[PDB]
Copies of this chain bind each other. A is one copy, B any other.
Amino acid sequence: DTMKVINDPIHGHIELHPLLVRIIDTPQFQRLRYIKQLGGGYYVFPGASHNRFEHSLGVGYLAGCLVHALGEKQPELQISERDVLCVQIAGLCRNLGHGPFSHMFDGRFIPLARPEVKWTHEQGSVMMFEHLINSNGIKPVMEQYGLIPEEDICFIKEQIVGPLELWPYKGRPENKSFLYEIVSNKRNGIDVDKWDYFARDCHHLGIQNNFDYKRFIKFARVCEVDNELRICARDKEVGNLYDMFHTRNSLHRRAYQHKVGNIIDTMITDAFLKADDYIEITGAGGKKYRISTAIDDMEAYTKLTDNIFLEILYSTDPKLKDAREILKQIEYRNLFKYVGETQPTGQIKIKREDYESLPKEVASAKPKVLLDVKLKAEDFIVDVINMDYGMQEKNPIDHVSFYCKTAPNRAIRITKNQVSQLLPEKFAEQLIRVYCKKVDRKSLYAARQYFVQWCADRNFTKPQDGDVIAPLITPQKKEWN
């Protein structure tokens, strides 16, 4: 039990403390080797074969880099070795809750399979961390290295998920407030998890990263802001922080929300829903779970990975035939068809709780055109995509604190108009894409008429080639024509 060195292509040679090695070398952590970072994105970007495992190593490494740098520049913060280890463990473990195909699972699958439950990957990360610690005897090893599990497990979970129910945290007191801004920053979103995925996703996607996290670390300092110690950036780095959120948005546009990647995620989700009654995942006491109920037992969840796709694709049971046929269509590239895209107008925003009603609304639109085929609710997919700077409608840079070179302990704010008139005026928008599971030319022509009528009925923006693919619908709506 000494240090291991691991060679990562993004970060080079990284050192792992032996307690971190003990955490990594568990079924709960090694599971992340079998979950793709970008899910169905790999079916569009063939370099994007990378998994949550290596990303987790990277996050843990960067968490260590930031906390060490702060402690070397500011010994008055009294950052301890124990603090450093706890921060590295939180960084390492904050992806433990991801399910098959990452965001597909918590973003698409669980909301449709278990609409009553409130599941997030962050909650999953805490539950899975706890399962990891308790199933592998990690607490006595934490003690052996000078951690106090009672306080430190709490601190680690709070770094992942936020306050577990006034300084609201219990794992550390207010004089270590800044430690909660490293792994998952709920104040403004500037955290080490982003820094890893920007570099790693870019390396794999074939799109080049333009944010420099190392520079950010060299300029970061802790200062008192409204009687709390916070991580501040140097004033003249404000431009680079606007660019960082721009880079995130650009990665969503180019890659994460690619229209074919999203439809592949939708098709996989559909196959899972059709397979859900038949796939068995064994959990504690030999109880059997399904894909949708594995989240209720961490022993079952440990065994729920991207493997489910192949278990379905390779099955021979006739009960799995419909699920298997969807995955086969993905292989033949016979995809659900893109019908069109629109945006709401203004601050107008469709909420998650209305998502399920949308296919029905589209199917109930009454286009005044002669239609051969009639389509049903279940023939449409309606994908609602939120493109924002991580804080809904808010500018995250308004929630960053800065210091200037002449008074490095004094925190200040910088407004948008102090920076540049070329920056966005809004920080959120929503795209709505519609697709049809019926792929013949008749169906697809009809689907477009339903779609364009629905856009008119909802006062959404005119679809870009609306005059060509629905010439009899677009003239009713005079802001469009």
Residue in B closest to A245 when the chains form the complex, CB atoms: B422
Does A212 lie at the interface of the complex (its beta carbon under 8 Å from any beta carbon of B)? yes
| 22 pairs of residues in contact across A and B, judged by CB atoms under 8 Å | A2-B405, A6-B46, A7-B205, A8-B46, A8-B47, A9-B205, A13-B212, A15-B218, A25-B331, A27-B332, A30-B331, A207-B212, A208-B209, A209-B210, A238-B464, A307-B311, A410-B468, A412-B468, A421-B425, A424-B424, A424-B425, A425-B425
Query: Is the pair A332, B468 in contact by a Cβ cutoff of 8 Å?
Result: no
In A345-394, the 8 Å CB interface with B consists of 345, 387
Does A144 lie at the interface of the complex (its beta carbon under 8 Å from any beta carbon of B)? no
In A458-479, the 8 Å CB interface with B consists of 461-465, 467-469
Query: Is the pair A203, B310 in contact by a Cβ cutoff of 8 Å?
Result: no
Asked whether A8 and B206 contact (CB < 8 A) given A422-B427, A426-B421, A469-B406, the answer is yes
Does A247 lie at the interface of the complex (its beta carbon under 8 Å from any beta carbon of B)? yes
Alpha-carbon gap, A316 to B215, bound state (A): 42
Alpha-carbon gap, A286 to B316, bound state (A): 9
| Residues in B whose Cβ lies below 8 Å from that of A6 | 46
In A213-262, the 8 Å CB interface with B consists of 214-215, 218-219, 235-236, 238-240, 243, 246-247, 249-250, 253-254
Query: Is the pair B46, A57 in contact by a Cβ cutoff of 8 Å?
Result: yes
Does A314 lie at the interface of the complex (its beta carbon under 8 Å from any beta carbon of B)? yes
Does A26 lie at the interface of the complex (its beta carbon under 8 Å from any beta carbon of B)? yes
Alpha-carbon gap, A92 to B418, bound state (A): 39
Residue in B closest to A404 when the chains form the complex, CB atoms: B465
In A50-108, the 8 Å CB interface with B consists of 50-51, 53-54, 57
| Residues in B whose Cβ lies below 8 Å from that of A214 | 12-13
Alpha-carbon gap, A425 to B462, bound state (A): 19
Q: Give, as a whole number of angstroms, the nearest-CB distance from A145 to chain B.
A: 18
Residue from the list B15, B236, B410, B429 in contact with A464, Cβ < 8 A: B236
Binary interface encoding of chain A residues 9-31 relative to chain B, with 1 for a CB under 8 A from any of its CBs, else 0: 11011010000010001110010
Copies of this polypeptide in the complex? 4
Does A417 lie at the interface of the complex (its beta carbon under 8 Å from any beta carbon of B)? yes
Does A148 lie at the interface of the complex (its beta carbon under 8 Å from any beta carbon of B)? no
Query: Is the pair B422, A27 in contact by a Cβ cutoff of 8 Å?
Result: no
Does A328 lie at the interface of the complex (its beta carbon under 8 Å from any beta carbon of B)? yes
| Residues in B whose Cβ lies below 8 Å from that of A419 | 464
Asked whether A420 and B12 contact (CB < 8 A) given A303-B314, A310-B305, the answer is no
Does A42 lie at the interface of the complex (its beta carbon under 8 Å from any beta carbon of B)? yes
Query: Is the pair B429, A422 in contact by a Cβ cutoff of 8 Å?
Result: yes
Does A118 lie at the interface of the complex (its beta carbon under 8 Å from any beta carbon of B)? no
Does A117 lie at the interface of the complex (its beta carbon under 8 Å from any beta carbon of B)? no
Residue in B closest to A34 when the chains form the complex, CB atoms: B310
| Residues in B whose Cβ lies below 8 Å from that of A47 | 7-10, 50, 54
Does A204 lie at the interface of the complex (its beta carbon under 8 Å from any beta carbon of B)? yes
Choose among A10, A203, A417, A420 the residue with the greatest number of B CB atoms under 10 Å from its CB. Answer: A420
Query: Is the pair B235, A464 in contact by a Cβ cutoff of 8 Å?
Result: yes
Residue in B closest to A249 when the chains form the complex, CB atoms: B422
| Residues in B whose Cβ lies below 8 Å from that of A42 | 33
How many residues of chain A are within 8 Å of chain B by beta carbon? 99
Does A343 lie at the interface of the complex (its beta carbon under 8 Å from any beta carbon of B)? yes
Query: Is the pair A49, B46 in contact by a Cβ cutoff of 8 Å?
Result: no
| Residues in B whose Cβ lies below 8 Å from that of A166 | none
Does A282 lie at the interface of the complex (its beta carbon under 8 Å from any beta carbon of B)? yes
| Residues in B whose Cβ lies below 8 Å from that of A209 | 208, 210
Query: Is the pair B464, A26 in contact by a Cβ cutoff of 8 Å?
Result: no
Query: Is the pair B9, A404 in contact by a Cβ cutoff of 8 Å?
Result: no
Residue from the list B281, B407, B417 in contact with A461, Cβ < 8 A: B417
Q: Give, as a whole number of angstroms, the nearest-CB distance from A214 to chain B.
A: 5
Query: Is the pair A27, B331 in contact by a Cβ cutoff of 8 Å?
Result: yes
Alpha-carbon gap, A468 to B10, bound state (A): 35
Alpha-carbon gap, A21 to B238, bound state (A): 26
Does A45 lie at the interface of the complex (its beta carbon under 8 Å from any beta carbon of B)? yes
Does A402 lie at the interface of the complex (its beta carbon under 8 Å from any beta carbon of B)? yes
Alpha-carbon gap, A88 to B103, bound state (A): 35
Does A5 lie at the interface of the complex (its beta carbon under 8 Å from any beta carbon of B)? yes
Residue in B closest to A51 when the chains form the complex, CB atoms: B49
Alpha-carbon gap, A7 to B419, bound state (A): 22
| Residues in B whose Cβ lies below 8 Å from that of A467 | 412
Query: Is the pair B406, A465 in contact by a Cβ cutoff of 8 Å?
Result: yes
Does A164 lie at the interface of the complex (its beta carbon under 8 Å from any beta carbon of B)? no
